[PDB]
Design an enzyme around this catalytic site. Structure first.
Site: not given
Lengths: 473, 485
Positions: A274-275
């Site tokens: 997850d960015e």
């Protein structure tokens, strides 16, 4: 009247005559006699056929379930429980079954609402009744850290106190984590632990404040408390991140993934991917390129969300596609295929289709709607893992995962009201053949078979939301 | 006094000499706000101009000070600085050959949080290119909300995949046999991310009850035409009345959805559910346009259902004021579109019912702020169905508080300037009608109530921006009611 059984078997056919009047796999059926509290019922492990396969035949002489493994027999005892029907009867039947995908998983978010060992053990037995063989525990997020580590001992000390909405937190001890993996092993389920990083790492900054970056907010609005350096009790996502260019960030992930792998005999260690919002693609590429290699040299197969597939690192890493079944892109069809070009397989978990945390159109209040509205039970079934797969091949699909997020679920009754019945469409897409074959792999048939197992679901203590979309008994 | 539109809250000249620009001024490192100021130096292709984001004061507010030593624009947001950077462009004047900022100090703040401009893509499909330019034009007047009219009887313009046949067979046409088309989901992300860089939100509207003939092209089971005795038809020559085939006319209120068919609401839930996922903005505009002859109870039940659908999606639903008699929805937002004098119906009373429900009003008076309304002077295209053509003065001759039925300014979410595209087929056509009088929109939206907020001052300040509007490529129409430079 074809005997209803979910997931739909590979080959099922009625028998000519009259039905059946009623090792450790026998204990699974004896305990299955919660539907109904000489004859001879045969449970044997022959072997030779495909893995996790079995053969079930029921007559009035005897019923014989024959699997190739203890797992295959354990999926045959699950089929016979669904087969159970004036007295207590097993229909004259013959089943030859085998799984379509080797990974048939259920994801549990323990970070948003910490779920105890008991409510997790129950969910293991429920998922195993649908021939699911992979438990995916979401151990960390912005709201808590749920696994007890000793290389990073401050995490469990200062990041497990709270949960979403001011609710109790907590964590799994390493003493308690072995109970989860050994209970699931007895149900022939593997336990894959996920530690969501780059983003979804706010709680990590509570204990190791030198690793986290300040939250990025964007447009709440919705908040009208935003995230700070304090326990985040909200549900907004994509604000936290690790200091991606600090080598201590990776020395942390090495300790965290190194110690974790020693407690999980399963082949997979899920890193997330997850960015944070507004994070550089090259910097996010560098992040998951490093951590996946850390898991790679640990002897484990790394898993990440499909948003990290454009990266240049990792080799043979497995993905979890969370995009819609019609793949409305940021690039998510092409980005998911990066995992297949790199030498790995895809686990498909369409958000609009298989995300169990999505609210029902019916209305049990709980759940979310961020996909494309509420998810009807039909749409959870209205997809094929082959066509809802960009342009790959069935050899490039490791399997199907059914994510249950706990932003809104705080009870085992809350977990069951949302998982079922839509979890059956997950096991069906995972176990049963494609929509090209299998006459019983249609919405008209699944909706009928999943409604006939309703009474069976109530007997095993499994709660479920009776969606008005289908007819129960 | 240096002319700037919208009229700032507090503006006062300075004691000293102005600011010479030359080729040595530095600009302070303020990320992209400096790039927004550098592109503003399209009017004219050391001392340093300071752009800083302090914070603490009102939202999207700023402070501008210009002397001889340095210029300093200080906003509380990136939007506040952006609107202060916009005031710099209007302030920029020429001494003789050098370019100069007048000695002046400005402390500004917006009156309404919603400062909107609507663009109709349904009647004439306007491409992403002509919409991005309109985003920059509206942002130069401190507008912060783009309203996209994505669907009508003339076409469906947004790409949905839960209802994929819509863009397949409802986007082929436009009004008058003009090119159709649609925005892909990939093309729609570019619009909302471009608007975000200009600190504008994108409000997508799907007119749901009536104004839905194009939806019957692809999902034919949902549509009900309904021609009134009036019409034009025979006189205009053919002028094809509405049928079960793409409508190329301009008449309204003839189409409708089967209000009591449950597939219609399962249709609206799928479209609005997929729509909400594509818009990070808080608003989903549902419409509320009722067909002619529709039962009041049926139209009430319809908007009662779809607004709850949008509400249960986590968004704030928006509708036209004609949907206020309904018993459904809670806290729904509104575009009041009737005249500033509140005429035929309880159009003021029906809009005030939204305030009884817990929502706010966006006021877009047809006689005042409808930018598609003909000029009385005469640049040809546009409409006159309000109370005749709309002069630039008449577009300004209103107060958002007094024309607001009988509420309070706190119950007004803001101001919207709708531009309908029945007659507008080019970007040059859009600007010929949108502008002059879109400044009257930004004035009513940003500037205080009725300061320099008189017709005599407005006609002087927006007339001084003529060279500035001509420099930005904005093809505004020279209304004879005002003197330019």
């Amino acid at each position: 009247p074809l005997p209803a059984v979910v997931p739909a078997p590979a080959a099922i056919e009625q028998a000519t005559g009259a039905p059946f009047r009623l090792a450790d796999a026998a204990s699974a059926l004896s305990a299955l006699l919660e539907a109904r509290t000489g004859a001879v019922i045969a449970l044997r492990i022959e072997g030779g056929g495909p893995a996790e396969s079995y053969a079930l035949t029921a007559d009035e002489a005897s019923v014989t379930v024959t699997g190739a493994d203890a797992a295959g027999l354990f999926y045959g005892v699950q089929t016979l429980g669904q087969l159970l029907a004036d007295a207590w009867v097993v229909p004259a039947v013959s089943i030859e079954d085998a799984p379509r995908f080797a990974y048939r998983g259920v994801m549990l978010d323990v970070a948003r609402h910490f779920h105890p060992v008991e409510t997790v053990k129950a969910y293991i037995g429920h998922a195993a009744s649908l021939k699911l063989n992979a438990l995916h525990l979401h151990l960390s997020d912005d709201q808590g850290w749920r696994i007890e580590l000793h290389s990073r001992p401050e995490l469990t000390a200062l990041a497990s106190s709270t949960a979403v909405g001011g609710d109790p937190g907590g964590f799994y001890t390493k003493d308690d984590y072995r109970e989860i993996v050994e209970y699931a092993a007895s149900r022939h389920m593997i336990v894959v632990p996920e530690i969501d990083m780059p983003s979804h790492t706010h709680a990590i900054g509570l204990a190791y404040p030198e690793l986290a970056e300040e939250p990025v907010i964007t447009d709440p609005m919705r908040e009208t408390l935003p995230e700070s350096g304090t326990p985040y009790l909200g549900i907004e996502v994509g604000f936290s991140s690790l200091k991606i260019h600090d080598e201590a960030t990776y020395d942390f992930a090495a300790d965290v993934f190194g110690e974790l792998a020693g407690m999980t005999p399963g082949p997979y260690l899920h890193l997330g991917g997850d960015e944070a919002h507004g994070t550089a693609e090259e910097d996010f590429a560098l992040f998951v390129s490093r951590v996946s290699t850390i898991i790679a040299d640990l002897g484990k197969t790394p898993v990440a969300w499909h948003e990290a597939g454009d990266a240049g690192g990792l080799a043979g890493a497995t993905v979890g596609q969370y995009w819609g079944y019609v793949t409305p892109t940021d690039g998510m069809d092409d980005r998911a295929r990066g995992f297949v070009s790199n030498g790995g397989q895809l686990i498909l978990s369409p958000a609009d289709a298989i995300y169990l945390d999505m609210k029902y159109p019916t209305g049990p209040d709980l759940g979310l709607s961020w996909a494309n509205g509420p998810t009807s039970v039909q749409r959870a079934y209205d997809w094929e893992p082959s066509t809802v797969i960009p342009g790959i091949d069935d050899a490039d699909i490791l399997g199907v995962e059914a994510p249950l997020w706990s932003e809104t679920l705080r009870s085992l009754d809350d977990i069951e009201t949302m998982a079922f019945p839509r979890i059956a469409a997950a096991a069906e897409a995972a176990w049963s053949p494609a929509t090209g074959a299998s006459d019983l792999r249609t919405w008209e048939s699944f909706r009928a078979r999943v409604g006939a197992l309703g009474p069976l679901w109530t007997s095993l203590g499994i709660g479920f939301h009776p969606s008005g979309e289908i007819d129960w008994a």
